[PDB]
Design a binder for this molecule. Structure first.
Ligand code: CL
Ligand code: CL
Ligand code: FE
Ligand code: FE
Ligand code: FE
Ligand code: FE
Lengths: 174, 174
């Protein structure tokens, strides 16, 4: 049967979840226990962590604008997600999504990671660009598996200490 | 690096490929050699074949309307894809997409099937509802792996012959 329910108007769904598409929640997964992880991400939200996804990530910026800070060819690059833009991110490309606008909405689609395929979350030194800290995780639930990770990094000067120049990363806010 | 290129305006891309979003082509895959198969399907297009996808299928009817003829709980059902609707189809639910409107466009996302995971394509008797014919295929390229399959069914009264009531299926057009 239709395990995930019948079709429904997306724009309306987005409007109805506006209160969740802003701090402190910021995002909302559309269907539960599905192989395709379908999420709508709002704003505003800025972050310093870079994601290392073992699988591809699909983006469709439905409302507003956002951008992805990346590490392409060993260089800090930016991929803009202007309203109406779609994008497919190859596996492992380091990315840090920035969503400055309130009312913005981006459809983001990923796949459930199989046992043994880990996601990486890392931070880089704003001084020398060296890797500061990396945590690998078997991502099962973003709600319970991710927040503590980021929190443990912000609360630790040790984890935030660059092993190259000794500069202590700011943590939560750049 | 960005194997699949940089972000780009989707509505514009769709407009630019209008000539392909209608017979005889009907659809256009956005990126090649990616794990996520991202396709935009136009119209008009009607078909009698039901697809048995071993994995989930995501739909977002961007322009126009369409509908999916299904087989839920052993009964012929219809799931409407009205403009603006999104839908996630569970694995193996038999579906036959109908796209009556010219100018319509639906974003359809699937996953590359791993070796050994086969797709099924079948037809049912419009008289008794019994399975008439089924072909399983390792779907690598829709362009070369699917058209011959449908064609061999239409050209064969044997394959089109219901094993229950003997009624010979119409073939291409209901
Ligand atoms: Cl994001
Ligand atoms: Cl379709
Ligand atoms: Fe990510
Ligand atoms: Fe440093
Ligand atoms: Fe299908
Ligand atoms: Fe029959």
């Amino acid at each position: 049967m239709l395990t995930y329910g019948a079709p429904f108007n997306f724009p309306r769904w987005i409007d109805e979840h506006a209160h969740l598409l802003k701090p402190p929640v910021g995002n909302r997964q559309v269907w539960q226990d599905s192989d395709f992880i379908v999420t709508v991400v709002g704003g505003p939200n800025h972050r310093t962590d870079y994601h290392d996804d073992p699988l591809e990530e699909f983006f469709y910026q439905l409302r507003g604008n956002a951008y992805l800070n990346l590490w392409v060819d060993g260089r800090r690059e930016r991929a803009d997600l202007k309203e109406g833009d779609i994008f497919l991110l190859p596996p492992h490309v380091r990315h840090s999504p920035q969503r400055p606008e309130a009312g913005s909405a981006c459809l983001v689609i990923e796949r459930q990671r199989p046992a043994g395929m880990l996601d990486g979350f890392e931070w880089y030194c704003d001084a020398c660009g060296h890797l500061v800290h990396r945590v690998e995780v078997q991502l099962k639930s973003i709600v319970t598996d991710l927040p503590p990770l980021f929190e443990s990094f912000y609360a630790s000067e040790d984890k935030r200490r660059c092993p190259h120049c000794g500069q202590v990363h700011p943590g939560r806010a750049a």
